[PDB]
Write a protein that binds this ligand. Sequence first.
Ligand SMILES: [Fe+3]
Length: 54
Amino acid sequence: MAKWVCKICGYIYDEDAGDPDNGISPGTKFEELPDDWVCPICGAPKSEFEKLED
Ligand SMILES: [Fe+3]
């Protein structure tokens, strides 16, 4: 499981945590989030996220 940052607002999408309040179970990989899922803080699309890895 990995972490991805919203380049706009700094929210971390943690795969371990998911986003249950917006229909995403803990353990959902970023690639598997629906194409229309957005950052729960700022509304940015998936395109605005970057994986926190080298
Ligand atoms: Fe954001």
